[PDB]
Amino acid sequence: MISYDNYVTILDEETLKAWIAKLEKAPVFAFDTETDSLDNISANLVGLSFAIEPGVAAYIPVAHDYLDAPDQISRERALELLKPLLEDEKALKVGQNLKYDRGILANYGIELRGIAFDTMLESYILNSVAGRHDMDSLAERWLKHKTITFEEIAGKGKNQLTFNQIALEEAGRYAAEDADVTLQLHLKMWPDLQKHKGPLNVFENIEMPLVPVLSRIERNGVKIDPKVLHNHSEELTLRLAELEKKAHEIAGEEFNLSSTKQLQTILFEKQGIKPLKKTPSTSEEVLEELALDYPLPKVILEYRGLAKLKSTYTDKLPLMINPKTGRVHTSYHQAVTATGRLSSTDPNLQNIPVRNEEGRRIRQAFIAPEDYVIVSADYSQIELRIMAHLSRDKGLLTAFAEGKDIHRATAAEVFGLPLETVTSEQRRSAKAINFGLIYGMSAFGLARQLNIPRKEAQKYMDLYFERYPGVLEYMERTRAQAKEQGYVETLDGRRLYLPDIKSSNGARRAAAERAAINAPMQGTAADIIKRAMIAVDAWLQAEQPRVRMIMQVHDELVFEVHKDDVDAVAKQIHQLMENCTRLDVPLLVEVGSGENWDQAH
DNA sequence: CGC
Ligand SMILES: [Eu+2]
């Protein structure tokens, strides 16, 4: 258990000043903030907690306001006394997801510096797939300690209390323990993080520096036109009605556009071959085969897609606009993917269809405020260039070197013919091979994407490996070190542990082998993208130009740049992205601009 | 992930 005896509750300036003096001389100290909401931009600071040493932590309530709440130091007085310490780059801080804490302080004109250790990121760099990297999971994993849960003090359901409604002492037990546990977690993980220069490098120079830039991107938000979004919605309703009619008109009667129920009773009952097509799916889509000649399955295909899109983005996005800023603030996750790439939610910017006309209309709703323009900076096929570097292949390297289209260059070599004459079907075959290799695609999966028979796909792969020998070496060498040491690394030293590499189970092990080939390339892209963000944000912070970094999705960074400064700024972003990251992989940055995200894209 |  945890009583009111463990940690102290600071209710007076004199005691707060005694603690600030102790904090000033501590080598590092843990700190956490408590608020009345998860929404960073509109949340109010309810209190703060600190920990100077294991077992020694305190809670400073500043805004609890339930009926008859005891006097507390005022939020303004507490912050002005704490400000010097918080803004001191030399006073080192530890915390669980400091991104959140940095933002809250920003709501009060305070610039959190000394953002040295994030236990969430410590855990993530040590072993990204060890489990969840939230504090409750961390405490139980590294300390066999079960923390007080937020529900334990606030409750559940709609009648859950906000932090300011909880009693001083209850709040104190919770907040002070977090600070305490965080420091203990750091003390256990920080030493471990040094047994290897790779992970240590990524944590120190990539992850940690990225904490404040992610906070700034999240707090900046993105401008979204709800009118455009609504037009699109109304139109889609009309297109869904029409499409349904087109389906009915083709056969007879009414029905759901649900397979293995209403479709099979129609489609194969009027000629075709029995099996269905799962919405397993990105390998066998029976419905889009028939689509090249058959009309019905083609309309059902396009119907489902528009249905998904409308409810996921057209109807959701407008509801995500924040009343305080009038912008949408997406949640970026730094410690979630196995490979190290950032992920996104509310909205999940990465699920907006790219090569689909409708997804483009979603992107047009992402606009620039008056006098500004949206600028998109993207790393052209970064993972493909990374694979070229990793395989040391002179052919692939030279293709990128002389500005030729790698897919046409690849097909020119694989099919043995002039570059100017390679056909679209040949370029399409080479493209499938090139991207298949990055995911470690089996010679049969390639056959299912290209629609060619098995062994005809194999015929192509053998010709590829013979023309580009260095790629097979990489594949073999990577599957080798994966078994020998249970993990693979990126160019910067980031690791992906593969427990199922010697699984003794068939497919469970196959998966581990696919991850072995893929992760080094995907993780390296992520490391590169993270370094560009840090580099770009540094310039932004020092030079103060008229530009905001507003998004990060796939291999691109999106900004809002003033119309009168677009040229000078584009020159600068470009140089930062293709020169101040890794000097080994041959990188190319495509910069564009427009009135909205789709125009610059 | 964070209250
Ligand atoms: Eu907390």
Coordinates of C-alpha atoms (C1' of nucleotides) and ligand atoms in Angstrom, one line a residue:
Chain A
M1 CA 0.0 0.0 0.0
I2 CA 1.1 3.7 0.2
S3 CA 0.0 6.0 3.0
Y4 CA 0.0 9.7 3.6
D5 CA 3.3 9.2 5.5
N6 CA 5.6 8.4 2.6
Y7 CA 5.6 11.7 0.7
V8 CA 5.1 15.3 1.8
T9 CA 2.4 17.7 0.6
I10 CA 3.9 21.2 0.2
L11 CA 1.3 23.8 1.3
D12 CA 3.6 26.7 2.0
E13 CA 6.2 28.9 0.3
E14 CA 8.8 28.3 3.0
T15 CA 8.8 24.6 2.5
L16 CA 8.7 25.0 -1.3
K17 CA 11.8 27.2 -1.2
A18 CA 13.6 24.5 1.0
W19 CA 12.9 21.9 -1.6
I20 CA 13.9 24.2 -4.5
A21 CA 17.3 24.6 -2.8
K22 CA 17.7 20.9 -2.5
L23 CA 16.6 20.4 -6.1
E24 CA 19.2 22.9 -7.3
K25 CA 22.1 20.8 -6.0
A26 CA 20.7 17.4 -6.9
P27 CA 22.6 15.8 -9.9
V28 CA 19.3 14.9 -11.5
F29 CA 15.7 14.9 -10.2
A30 CA 12.4 13.6 -11.4
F31 CA 9.4 15.8 -12.0
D32 CA 5.9 15.3 -13.2
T33 CA 2.8 17.6 -13.8
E34 CA -0.9 17.0 -13.0
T35 CA -3.7 18.6 -15.0
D36 CA -7.5 18.7 -15.4
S37 CA -7.4 17.2 -18.9
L38 CA -5.4 15.0 -21.3
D39 CA -5.8 17.7 -24.0
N40 CA -2.4 19.5 -23.7
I41 CA -3.4 22.8 -25.3
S42 CA -6.5 23.5 -23.0
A43 CA -5.4 21.6 -19.9
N44 CA -4.9 23.5 -16.6
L45 CA -2.0 22.7 -14.3
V46 CA -3.5 21.3 -11.0
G47 CA -0.2 20.4 -9.4
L48 CA 3.5 19.3 -9.6
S49 CA 5.6 16.6 -8.0
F50 CA 9.3 16.1 -7.6
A51 CA 11.7 13.4 -6.4
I52 CA 15.3 14.1 -5.4
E53 CA 16.3 10.6 -4.3
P54 CA 14.6 7.2 -4.0
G55 CA 11.9 7.5 -1.3
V56 CA 12.1 11.3 -1.1
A57 CA 9.4 13.0 -3.2
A58 CA 6.8 15.7 -2.7
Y59 CA 3.6 17.0 -4.2
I60 CA 2.8 20.7 -4.6
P61 CA -1.0 21.3 -5.1
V62 CA -1.8 24.6 -6.8
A63 CA -5.3 24.3 -8.2
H64 CA -7.5 21.8 -6.3
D65 CA -10.9 23.5 -5.9
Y66 CA -13.4 21.0 -4.4
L67 CA -15.7 22.2 -1.6
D68 CA -13.6 23.3 1.4
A69 CA -10.2 22.6 -0.2
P70 CA -7.4 23.8 2.2
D71 CA -5.2 26.8 1.2
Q72 CA -2.6 26.0 -1.4
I73 CA 0.3 28.0 -2.8
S74 CA -1.2 29.9 -5.8
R75 CA -0.4 28.5 -9.3
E76 CA 1.2 31.9 -10.2
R77 CA 3.5 32.1 -7.1
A78 CA 4.5 28.4 -7.3
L79 CA 5.4 28.8 -11.0
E80 CA 7.4 32.0 -10.6
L81 CA 9.5 30.4 -7.8
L82 CA 9.9 27.2 -9.9
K83 CA 10.6 28.9 -13.2
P84 CA 14.4 29.5 -12.8
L85 CA 14.9 25.8 -12.0
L86 CA 12.7 24.5 -14.8
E87 CA 14.3 26.9 -17.4
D88 CA 17.9 26.0 -16.4
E89 CA 19.5 23.8 -19.0
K90 CA 22.1 22.7 -16.4
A91 CA 19.4 21.4 -13.9
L92 CA 18.8 18.0 -15.3
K93 CA 15.3 16.5 -15.3
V94 CA 13.9 12.9 -15.5
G95 CA 10.3 12.1 -16.3
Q96 CA 7.8 9.7 -17.9
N97 CA 6.8 11.2 -21.3
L98 CA 8.3 14.7 -20.8
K99 CA 6.7 15.8 -24.1
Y100 CA 3.5 16.2 -22.2
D101 CA 5.0 18.1 -19.3
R102 CA 7.0 20.5 -21.5
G103 CA 3.7 21.5 -23.2
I104 CA 1.8 22.2 -20.0
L105 CA 4.6 24.5 -18.8
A106 CA 4.5 26.2 -22.2
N107 CA 0.9 27.2 -21.4
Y108 CA 2.4 29.5 -18.7
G109 CA 5.2 31.1 -20.6
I110 CA 7.8 28.6 -19.2
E111 CA 10.4 27.0 -21.4
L112 CA 11.4 23.6 -20.0
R113 CA 15.1 23.0 -20.5
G114 CA 17.4 20.3 -19.3
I115 CA 15.1 17.6 -20.8
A116 CA 17.8 14.9 -20.3
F117 CA 16.0 11.6 -19.4
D118 CA 12.6 10.2 -20.4
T119 CA 12.1 6.8 -18.8
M120 CA 9.6 6.0 -21.5
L121 CA 12.3 6.4 -24.1
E122 CA 14.9 4.7 -21.9
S123 CA 12.6 1.6 -21.9
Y124 CA 11.9 2.0 -25.7
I125 CA 15.6 2.1 -26.7
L126 CA 16.6 -0.8 -24.4
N127 CA 14.1 -3.1 -26.1
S128 CA 11.2 -1.7 -28.1
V129 CA 9.3 -5.0 -28.1
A130 CA 9.7 -5.9 -24.5
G131 CA 6.2 -4.8 -23.8
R132 CA 4.3 -1.6 -23.1
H133 CA 6.3 1.5 -22.2
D134 CA 3.8 3.3 -20.0
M135 CA 4.8 3.8 -16.3
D136 CA 2.4 1.2 -14.8
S137 CA 3.9 -1.5 -17.0
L138 CA 7.4 -0.2 -16.4
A139 CA 7.1 -0.2 -12.6
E140 CA 6.0 -3.8 -12.6
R141 CA 8.6 -4.9 -15.0
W142 CA 11.7 -3.3 -13.6
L143 CA 10.7 -2.8 -10.0
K144 CA 8.1 -5.5 -9.3
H145 CA 6.0 -2.6 -8.0
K146 CA 2.4 -2.0 -8.6
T147 CA 1.7 1.7 -8.9
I148 CA -1.4 3.5 -7.8
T149 CA -3.6 3.8 -10.9
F150 CA -5.3 7.0 -12.0
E151 CA -8.7 5.1 -11.7
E152 CA -7.9 4.3 -8.1
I153 CA -8.0 8.0 -7.1
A154 CA -10.3 9.4 -9.8
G155 CA -12.8 6.6 -10.6
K156 CA -14.2 5.2 -13.8
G157 CA -17.0 6.0 -16.3
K158 CA -18.5 9.5 -17.0
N159 CA -18.5 10.2 -13.3
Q160 CA -14.8 10.1 -13.1
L161 CA -13.2 13.0 -11.2
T162 CA -10.8 15.4 -12.7
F163 CA -7.5 16.0 -10.8
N164 CA -8.6 19.2 -9.2
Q165 CA -11.5 17.5 -7.5
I166 CA -9.4 14.9 -5.7
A167 CA -8.4 15.4 -2.0
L168 CA -4.9 16.9 -1.5
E169 CA -3.6 13.8 0.3
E170 CA -5.0 11.3 -2.2
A171 CA -3.6 13.4 -5.1
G172 CA -0.3 13.6 -3.2
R173 CA 0.1 9.8 -2.8
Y174 CA -0.4 9.3 -6.5
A175 CA 1.7 12.2 -7.9
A176 CA 4.6 11.8 -5.5
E177 CA 4.8 8.1 -6.2
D178 CA 5.0 8.7 -9.9
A179 CA 7.9 11.0 -9.4
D180 CA 9.6 8.6 -7.0
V181 CA 9.1 5.5 -9.3
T182 CA 10.3 7.5 -12.3
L183 CA 13.6 8.3 -10.6
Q184 CA 14.0 4.6 -9.5
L185 CA 13.2 3.5 -13.1
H186 CA 15.9 5.9 -14.4
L187 CA 18.4 4.6 -11.9
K188 CA 17.8 1.0 -13.0
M189 CA 17.8 1.7 -16.8
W190 CA 20.4 4.5 -17.3
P191 CA 23.3 2.2 -16.4
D192 CA 22.0 -0.6 -18.6
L193 CA 21.7 1.8 -21.4
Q194 CA 25.5 2.2 -21.5
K195 CA 26.5 -1.4 -22.0
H196 CA 26.1 -0.6 -25.8
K197 CA 27.2 2.5 -27.7
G198 CA 24.5 1.9 -30.4
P199 CA 21.3 2.3 -28.3
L200 CA 23.0 4.9 -26.2
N201 CA 23.7 7.0 -29.3
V202 CA 20.1 6.7 -30.6
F203 CA 18.7 7.6 -27.1
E204 CA 21.0 10.6 -26.6
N205 CA 21.2 12.2 -30.0
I206 CA 18.0 11.1 -31.6
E207 CA 15.2 10.3 -29.2
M208 CA 15.9 12.8 -26.3
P209 CA 16.4 15.9 -28.6
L210 CA 13.2 15.0 -30.4
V211 CA 11.0 15.3 -27.2
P212 CA 10.6 19.1 -27.4
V213 CA 10.2 19.3 -31.2
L214 CA 7.3 16.7 -31.1
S215 CA 5.7 18.9 -28.3
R216 CA 6.0 22.0 -30.5
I217 CA 4.6 20.2 -33.6
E218 CA 1.6 18.8 -31.6
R219 CA 0.9 22.2 -30.0
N220 CA 1.1 24.1 -33.3
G221 CA -1.5 21.9 -34.8
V222 CA -2.8 21.9 -38.4
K223 CA -5.4 24.1 -40.1
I224 CA -8.4 22.1 -41.4
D225 CA -11.3 23.5 -43.5
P226 CA -14.5 22.0 -42.1
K227 CA -16.6 23.4 -45.0
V228 CA -14.6 21.4 -47.6
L229 CA -14.8 18.3 -45.3
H230 CA -18.6 18.8 -45.2
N231 CA -19.1 19.1 -48.9
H232 CA -17.1 15.9 -49.4
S233 CA -19.3 14.2 -46.8
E234 CA -22.6 15.2 -48.6
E235 CA -21.2 14.2 -51.9
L236 CA -20.0 10.8 -50.7
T237 CA -23.5 10.1 -49.4
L238 CA -24.8 10.7 -52.9
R239 CA -22.1 8.5 -54.5
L240 CA -22.8 5.7 -52.0
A241 CA -26.5 5.9 -52.9
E242 CA -25.7 5.8 -56.6
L243 CA -23.2 2.9 -56.2
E244 CA -25.8 0.9 -54.3
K245 CA -28.3 1.4 -57.1
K246 CA -25.6 0.3 -59.7
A247 CA -25.1 -2.9 -57.7
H248 CA -28.8 -3.7 -57.5
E249 CA -29.4 -2.6 -61.2
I250 CA -26.8 -5.2 -62.3
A251 CA -28.4 -8.3 -60.7
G252 CA -31.8 -8.1 -59.0
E253 CA -33.4 -7.4 -55.6
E254 CA -31.8 -5.5 -52.6
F255 CA -28.9 -6.6 -50.4
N256 CA -26.0 -5.7 -48.1
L257 CA -22.6 -5.2 -49.7
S258 CA -21.3 -7.8 -47.2
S259 CA -19.3 -10.8 -48.5
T260 CA -19.8 -14.4 -47.4
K261 CA -23.5 -13.5 -47.0
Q262 CA -25.1 -11.5 -49.8
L263 CA -22.3 -11.3 -52.4
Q264 CA -21.5 -15.0 -52.9
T265 CA -25.3 -15.7 -53.4
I266 CA -25.0 -13.3 -56.4
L267 CA -21.4 -13.2 -57.8
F268 CA -20.7 -17.0 -58.3
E269 CA -24.4 -17.9 -58.6
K270 CA -24.2 -15.9 -61.9
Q271 CA -20.8 -17.4 -62.9
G272 CA -17.4 -17.2 -61.3
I273 CA -15.5 -19.4 -58.8
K274 CA -16.9 -20.0 -55.3
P275 CA -14.4 -18.5 -52.7
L276 CA -14.8 -14.9 -51.2
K277 CA -12.4 -12.0 -50.6
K278 CA -11.4 -10.9 -47.1
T279 CA -11.5 -7.2 -46.3
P280 CA -4.9 -12.4 -45.9
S281 CA -6.4 -9.4 -47.9
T282 CA -3.3 -7.7 -49.2
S283 CA -2.4 -11.0 -51.0
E284 CA -5.7 -12.5 -52.2
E285 CA -8.4 -10.0 -53.3
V286 CA -10.7 -12.2 -55.4
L287 CA -13.0 -9.2 -56.0
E288 CA -10.4 -7.0 -57.8
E289 CA -9.4 -9.8 -60.1
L290 CA -12.9 -10.0 -61.6
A291 CA -12.7 -6.2 -61.7
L292 CA -10.7 -6.1 -64.9
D293 CA -13.7 -7.4 -66.9
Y294 CA -16.6 -8.1 -64.6
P295 CA -18.6 -5.0 -63.5
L296 CA -20.4 -6.0 -60.2
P297 CA -17.4 -6.8 -58.0
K298 CA -15.8 -3.6 -59.3
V299 CA -18.6 -1.4 -57.8
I300 CA -18.7 -3.3 -54.5
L301 CA -15.0 -2.8 -54.2
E302 CA -15.2 1.0 -54.6
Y303 CA -18.3 1.2 -52.4
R304 CA -16.6 -0.3 -49.3
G305 CA -13.7 2.0 -49.8
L306 CA -15.7 5.3 -49.9
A307 CA -17.8 4.0 -46.9
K308 CA -14.7 3.5 -44.8
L309 CA -13.1 6.9 -45.7
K310 CA -16.2 9.0 -45.0
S311 CA -16.8 7.7 -41.5
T312 CA -13.1 7.7 -40.6
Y313 CA -12.0 11.1 -41.9
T314 CA -14.8 13.1 -43.5
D315 CA -17.1 12.8 -40.4
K316 CA -14.4 12.6 -37.7
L317 CA -11.9 15.3 -38.5
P318 CA -14.3 18.3 -38.2
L319 CA -15.1 17.1 -34.7
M320 CA -11.4 17.1 -33.7
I321 CA -11.0 20.9 -34.2
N322 CA -10.0 22.5 -30.9
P323 CA -12.2 25.4 -29.7
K324 CA -9.2 27.2 -28.1
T325 CA -6.9 27.3 -31.2
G326 CA -9.3 26.4 -34.0
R327 CA -6.8 23.8 -35.2
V328 CA -6.4 20.0 -35.1
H329 CA -3.7 18.7 -32.8
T330 CA -2.7 15.1 -33.7
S331 CA -1.1 12.8 -31.1
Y332 CA 2.4 11.6 -32.2
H333 CA 3.8 8.4 -30.5
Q334 CA 7.5 8.1 -30.0
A335 CA 7.6 4.8 -28.2
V336 CA 5.2 2.5 -30.0
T337 CA 6.5 1.0 -33.2
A338 CA 8.8 -2.0 -33.3
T339 CA 11.1 -0.4 -35.9
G340 CA 11.4 3.1 -34.4
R341 CA 9.2 5.1 -36.8
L342 CA 6.8 7.6 -35.3
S343 CA 3.1 6.7 -35.4
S344 CA 0.1 9.0 -35.4
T345 CA -3.5 9.0 -34.0
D346 CA -6.5 11.4 -33.7
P347 CA -6.1 11.7 -36.5
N348 CA -4.0 8.8 -37.8
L349 CA -2.4 10.8 -40.6
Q350 CA -0.8 7.7 -42.1
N351 CA -4.0 5.9 -43.0
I352 CA -5.2 8.6 -45.4
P353 CA -5.0 6.8 -48.8
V354 CA -2.1 8.2 -50.9
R355 CA -2.6 6.6 -54.3
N356 CA -6.3 7.0 -54.4
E357 CA -8.2 10.1 -55.7
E358 CA -10.4 10.4 -52.6
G359 CA -7.5 10.6 -50.2
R360 CA -6.3 13.6 -52.2
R361 CA -9.5 15.4 -51.3
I362 CA -8.9 14.7 -47.7
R363 CA -5.5 16.4 -48.0
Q364 CA -7.1 19.5 -49.7
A365 CA -8.9 20.1 -46.4
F366 CA -5.5 20.7 -44.8
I367 CA -5.0 24.4 -45.5
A368 CA -2.6 27.3 -44.9
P369 CA -3.8 30.3 -43.0
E370 CA -4.0 33.7 -44.8
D371 CA -0.7 34.8 -46.3
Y372 CA 0.9 31.4 -45.8
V373 CA 1.5 28.3 -48.0
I374 CA 1.8 24.6 -47.2
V375 CA 5.2 23.3 -48.0
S376 CA 5.9 19.6 -48.3
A377 CA 9.5 18.1 -48.0
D378 CA 9.8 14.4 -48.7
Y379 CA 12.5 11.8 -48.9
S380 CA 12.1 10.1 -52.3
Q381 CA 12.1 6.3 -51.7
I382 CA 14.3 6.5 -48.8
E383 CA 14.1 2.8 -47.8
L384 CA 15.0 1.8 -51.3
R385 CA 18.2 4.0 -51.2
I386 CA 19.0 2.6 -47.8
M387 CA 18.8 -0.9 -49.2
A388 CA 21.2 0.2 -52.0
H389 CA 23.7 1.4 -49.4
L390 CA 23.3 -1.6 -47.1
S391 CA 23.9 -4.0 -50.0
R392 CA 26.9 -2.1 -51.4
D393 CA 25.6 -2.7 -54.9
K394 CA 27.4 -0.5 -57.5
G395 CA 24.5 -1.0 -59.9
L396 CA 21.8 0.3 -57.6
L397 CA 24.1 3.0 -56.3
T398 CA 25.0 4.2 -59.7
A399 CA 21.3 4.3 -60.7
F400 CA 20.5 6.7 -57.9
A401 CA 23.8 8.5 -58.5
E402 CA 23.0 9.5 -62.1
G403 CA 19.4 10.4 -61.4
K404 CA 17.8 7.5 -63.2
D405 CA 14.4 5.9 -62.2
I406 CA 15.5 2.9 -60.1
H407 CA 12.4 0.9 -61.2
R408 CA 13.1 1.4 -64.9
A409 CA 16.9 0.9 -64.3
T410 CA 16.2 -2.3 -62.4
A411 CA 13.9 -3.6 -65.2
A412 CA 16.5 -2.5 -67.8
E413 CA 19.0 -4.9 -66.1
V414 CA 16.6 -7.7 -65.1
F415 CA 14.9 -8.0 -68.5
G416 CA 18.1 -7.0 -70.4
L417 CA 17.0 -4.1 -72.6
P418 CA 17.6 -0.3 -73.2
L419 CA 16.4 2.1 -70.5
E420 CA 14.4 4.3 -72.9
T421 CA 12.5 1.2 -74.1
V422 CA 11.4 -0.4 -70.8
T423 CA 7.6 -0.8 -70.9
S424 CA 5.2 0.1 -68.1
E425 CA 4.5 -3.6 -67.4
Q426 CA 8.2 -4.2 -67.0
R427 CA 8.7 -1.2 -64.7
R428 CA 5.7 -2.4 -62.7
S429 CA 7.3 -5.9 -62.3
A430 CA 10.7 -4.4 -61.2
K431 CA 8.9 -2.1 -58.7
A432 CA 7.1 -5.1 -57.1
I433 CA 10.5 -6.8 -56.7
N434 CA 12.2 -3.8 -55.3
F435 CA 9.6 -3.1 -52.7
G436 CA 9.1 -6.8 -52.1
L437 CA 12.7 -7.2 -51.0
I438 CA 12.4 -4.5 -48.3
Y439 CA 9.6 -6.5 -46.7
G440 CA 11.4 -9.7 -47.4
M441 CA 8.7 -10.9 -49.7
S442 CA 8.6 -14.6 -50.7
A443 CA 8.9 -15.4 -54.4
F444 CA 5.2 -16.5 -54.2
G445 CA 3.8 -13.4 -52.6
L446 CA 5.4 -11.5 -55.5
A447 CA 3.5 -13.8 -57.9
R448 CA 0.2 -12.8 -56.1
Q449 CA 0.9 -9.0 -56.4
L450 CA 2.1 -9.2 -60.1
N451 CA -0.5 -11.9 -61.0
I452 CA 2.1 -14.0 -62.8
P453 CA 2.4 -17.8 -62.1
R454 CA 4.8 -19.0 -59.3
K455 CA 8.3 -19.9 -60.6
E456 CA 7.8 -17.2 -63.2
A457 CA 8.2 -14.9 -60.3
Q458 CA 11.1 -17.0 -59.1
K459 CA 12.6 -16.6 -62.6
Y460 CA 12.5 -12.8 -62.1
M461 CA 14.1 -12.9 -58.6
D462 CA 17.0 -15.1 -59.7
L463 CA 17.7 -12.7 -62.5
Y464 CA 17.5 -9.8 -60.0
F465 CA 20.0 -11.4 -57.6
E466 CA 22.3 -12.2 -60.4
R467 CA 22.3 -8.7 -61.8
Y468 CA 22.3 -7.2 -58.2
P469 CA 24.4 -9.8 -56.2
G470 CA 25.0 -7.5 -53.3
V471 CA 21.4 -7.5 -52.3
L472 CA 21.4 -11.3 -51.7
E473 CA 24.5 -11.0 -49.6
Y474 CA 22.8 -8.4 -47.4
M475 CA 19.8 -10.6 -47.1
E476 CA 21.9 -13.6 -46.0
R477 CA 24.3 -11.6 -43.8
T478 CA 21.3 -10.0 -42.0
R479 CA 19.4 -13.3 -41.4
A480 CA 22.8 -14.6 -40.1
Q481 CA 23.5 -11.9 -37.4
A482 CA 19.8 -12.1 -36.4
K483 CA 20.2 -15.8 -35.4
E484 CA 23.7 -15.3 -33.9
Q485 CA 22.7 -12.5 -31.6
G486 CA 18.9 -12.2 -31.4
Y487 CA 18.6 -8.7 -32.9
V488 CA 19.4 -6.5 -35.9
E489 CA 20.5 -2.8 -35.9
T490 CA 20.1 0.3 -38.0
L491 CA 23.0 2.5 -39.2
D492 CA 22.7 4.6 -36.0
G493 CA 22.6 1.6 -33.7
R494 CA 18.9 1.3 -33.0
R495 CA 17.9 -2.4 -32.3
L496 CA 15.0 -4.7 -33.0
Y497 CA 15.1 -7.8 -30.9
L498 CA 13.8 -11.0 -32.5
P499 CA 12.8 -13.6 -30.0
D500 CA 11.1 -15.8 -32.6
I501 CA 14.2 -16.0 -34.7
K502 CA 15.0 -19.6 -33.5
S503 CA 11.3 -20.2 -32.7
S504 CA 11.2 -23.9 -33.8
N505 CA 7.7 -22.9 -35.0
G506 CA 7.3 -22.6 -38.8
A507 CA 5.7 -19.3 -39.7
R508 CA 6.4 -17.6 -36.3
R509 CA 10.0 -17.9 -37.3
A510 CA 9.4 -16.9 -40.9
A511 CA 8.0 -13.6 -39.6
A512 CA 11.1 -13.1 -37.5
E513 CA 13.2 -13.5 -40.6
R514 CA 11.2 -11.0 -42.6
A515 CA 11.6 -8.5 -39.8
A516 CA 15.3 -9.1 -39.8
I517 CA 15.7 -8.0 -43.4
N518 CA 13.2 -5.1 -43.1
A519 CA 13.9 -3.4 -39.7
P520 CA 17.4 -2.3 -40.6
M521 CA 16.0 -0.4 -43.6
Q522 CA 12.8 0.9 -41.9
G523 CA 14.5 1.9 -38.7
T524 CA 17.3 3.7 -40.6
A525 CA 14.6 5.8 -42.4
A526 CA 13.1 6.6 -39.1
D527 CA 16.4 7.6 -37.6
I528 CA 17.1 9.8 -40.6
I529 CA 13.6 11.4 -40.5
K530 CA 14.1 12.1 -36.7
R531 CA 17.5 13.7 -37.3
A532 CA 16.0 16.1 -40.0
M533 CA 13.3 17.1 -37.6
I534 CA 15.8 17.9 -34.9
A535 CA 18.0 19.8 -37.4
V536 CA 15.1 21.7 -38.9
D537 CA 13.6 22.6 -35.5
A538 CA 17.0 23.9 -34.3
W539 CA 17.2 26.4 -37.2
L540 CA 13.6 27.4 -36.5
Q541 CA 14.3 28.0 -32.9
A542 CA 17.5 30.0 -33.5
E543 CA 16.7 32.0 -36.6
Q544 CA 13.0 32.6 -35.9
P545 CA 11.7 32.6 -39.5
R546 CA 8.0 32.7 -40.5
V547 CA 7.5 28.9 -40.6
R548 CA 5.9 26.2 -38.4
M549 CA 6.5 22.5 -38.7
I550 CA 3.0 21.1 -38.7
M551 CA 3.2 17.4 -39.6
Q552 CA 5.2 14.3 -40.1
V553 CA 3.8 11.4 -42.1
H554 CA 5.6 8.5 -43.8
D555 CA 8.8 10.0 -45.2
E556 CA 7.7 13.6 -45.3
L557 CA 7.7 16.7 -43.1
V558 CA 5.0 19.4 -43.6
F559 CA 5.3 23.1 -42.9
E560 CA 3.4 26.4 -43.1
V561 CA 5.6 29.0 -44.7
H562 CA 4.9 32.7 -45.3
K563 CA 4.2 33.3 -49.0
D564 CA 6.8 36.0 -49.3
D565 CA 9.6 33.8 -47.9
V566 CA 8.9 30.5 -49.7
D567 CA 12.0 30.6 -51.8
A568 CA 14.7 31.3 -49.2
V569 CA 13.0 28.9 -46.8
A570 CA 12.7 26.0 -49.3
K571 CA 16.4 26.3 -50.0
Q572 CA 17.1 26.0 -46.3
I573 CA 14.7 23.1 -45.4
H574 CA 16.2 21.1 -48.4
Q575 CA 19.8 21.7 -47.4
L576 CA 19.0 20.7 -43.8
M577 CA 17.2 17.5 -44.8
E578 CA 19.7 16.2 -47.4
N579 CA 22.9 17.3 -45.8
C580 CA 22.7 17.5 -42.0
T581 CA 21.6 13.9 -41.4
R582 CA 23.6 10.8 -42.5
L583 CA 26.3 11.5 -45.1
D584 CA 26.5 7.9 -46.2
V585 CA 23.1 7.0 -47.7
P586 CA 22.5 8.9 -51.0
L587 CA 19.5 11.1 -50.1
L588 CA 17.1 13.1 -52.2
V589 CA 14.6 15.6 -50.9
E590 CA 11.6 16.7 -53.0
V591 CA 10.2 20.1 -51.9
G592 CA 6.9 21.4 -53.1
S593 CA 4.3 24.1 -52.1
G594 CA 0.7 25.1 -52.6
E595 CA -2.6 26.3 -51.0
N596 CA -3.2 23.1 -49.3
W597 CA -1.4 19.8 -48.4
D598 CA -2.6 18.1 -51.6
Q599 CA -1.3 20.9 -53.7
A600 CA 2.2 20.8 -52.1
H601 CA 2.1 16.9 -52.0
Chain B
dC1 C1' 2.0 7.8 -24.7
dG2 C1' -0.1 11.7 -21.3
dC3 C1' -4.7 13.4 -17.1
Ligands
EU1 EU 1.8 11.7 -13.4

